[PDB]
């Protein structure tokens, strides 16, 4: 059954920090915002590198979490993906094209493709979901924010000419946006976004880093799980959660408070090294790797996340973020 759909009582154990920047000439300050899949015993991770100079991305793989820190990084600026600003990836296999997509931000909502996740040198130069630039609704409501944190999820409707692919994004100004196109058209044809949730009075309650997952075998009110990062007390990052019966439906809070979050300081036990009070910008490690973003909740979720020493005092892009893991 769905023994790991934990309702309003999610509980986790965190590892210590698992992935650090390399001591190399790139002088990366933080490793951030992971996306990951597990295929035949190998974990494939994409993450962002952060320093005051800028953002770009890395790929690495490993078989053992305790050895992840020794995995060589492929710096994706060596692929056609290239130099420039790129951040905050999401990886999935778009089965109808037999291509992996890496969805990320480069100033717009962007994607690269690759037929083989094991060949990081082949990731394409970015192409954008919104060919004319930032949508009007986002430009009109962004204020002093930033258009960030792109997420695709597709429904599993039989007819591809009708099944929808949704692209979510945030503005660091209290809005969550959603566009759609058909499976047949994807990646082309994303509609003008709609605001699907907003918290204008406290923008930090609906900050960024959305994830939308299908729960395998769930056919009713909890078919879809929405996670959004919030900033609480003392700047501690945590995830709020909601559920819905469809991707473009009515979200109902699940575990959505700082005291009872989906994942946060309140419900994460550091059984070993205790190194962060923030559970930030994370993703579930997926074994069902296709564009439906399906989780099998007969098995414990593993959520790879960015954490940071709460006492670090740096410029924001120089924060010493490291990757860690929470497991149910």
Author numbering: -7 to -1, 30 to 350
Extract from the study:
Arabinoxylan arabinofuranohydrolases belonging to the GH62 family specifically remove α-1,2- or α-1,3- linked L-arabinofuranose decorations from xylan (Kellett et al., 1990). For the GH62 enzymes of S. thermophilum sequences of Abf62A/Abf62B belongs to subfamily GH62_2, while Abf62C is a member of the GH62_1 subfamily. Abf62A and Abf62C are both active against these substrates but have no detectable activity against CM-linear 1,5-α-L-arabinan, which contains exclusively non-terminal 1,5-α-L-arabinofuranose linkages, indicating that these enzymes lack endo-arabinanase activity. 1HNMR spectroscopy showed that both Abf62C and Abf62A are active against both α-1,2 and α-1,3 L-arabinofuranosyl linkages in wheat arabinoxylan.
The Abf62C apo structure contains one polypeptide chain (residues 30 to 350) in the asymmetric unit. Each ‘blade’ in this fold consists of either four (‘blade’ I, II, IV and III) or five (‘blade’ V) β-strands forming antiparallel β-sheets that are interconnected through loops of variable lengths to form a funnel-like structure that encircles the central cavity, which houses the active site. A comparative sequence analysis was undertaken to detect sequence conservation among various members of the two GH62 subfamilies, including structurally characterized representatives from the basidiomycete Ustilago maydis (UmAbf62A) and the ascomycete Podospora anserina (Siguier et al., 2014) points to three completely conserved residues Asp55, Asp171 and Glu230 as the catalytic triad of Abf62C. Surprisingly, despite significant sequence similarity between PaAbf62C and Abf62C enzymes (64% identity) and also the conserved calcium binding residue (H285 in PaAbf62C and His303 in Abf62C), the Abf62C structure does not harbour a calcium ion in its active site. This Abf62C feature is in line with the functional data presented above, which shows that Abf62C activity is not significantly affected by the presence of Ca2+ or chelating agents, suggesting structural and functional independence from divalent metal ion binding.
